[PDB]
Amino acid sequence: LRQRHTELEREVSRFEDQTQQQRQQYAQAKESLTTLNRLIPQVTLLLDET
């Protein structure tokens, strides 16, 4: 059970690492998507590269 606890702690660490990494990364991704869909949600088409 102590070995189980050690492995469970390792698993807690792994979950925390994954959740952090993913939430931060996808938060920056969300920010980038928001910037695109705010500033240039097909505003480029309005520009149309005319």
């Binding site: 606890h5 807690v12 993913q22 991704a29 980038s32 998507l33 480029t44």
Partner: protein, 49 residues
């Protein structure tokens, strides 16, 4: 800021992909939370044992 010159000529596909990645955000975060709390409950059980 993201990329350096990143298909600005046509970026809608990228917007869609990032939407998919935000869906991935939701799924991944919920999955991590459920698994970690379940295995915390397991930790508690192991402790009592």
């Amino acid at each position: 800021r993201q990329g350096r010159q990143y298909q600005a000529e046509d970026l809608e596909a990228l917007q869609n992909e990032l939407e998919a990645r935000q869906e991935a955000l939701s799924l991944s975060v919920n999955e991590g939370g459920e698994r970690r709390m379940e295995m915390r409950q397991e930790l508690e059980q192991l402790k009592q044992k």
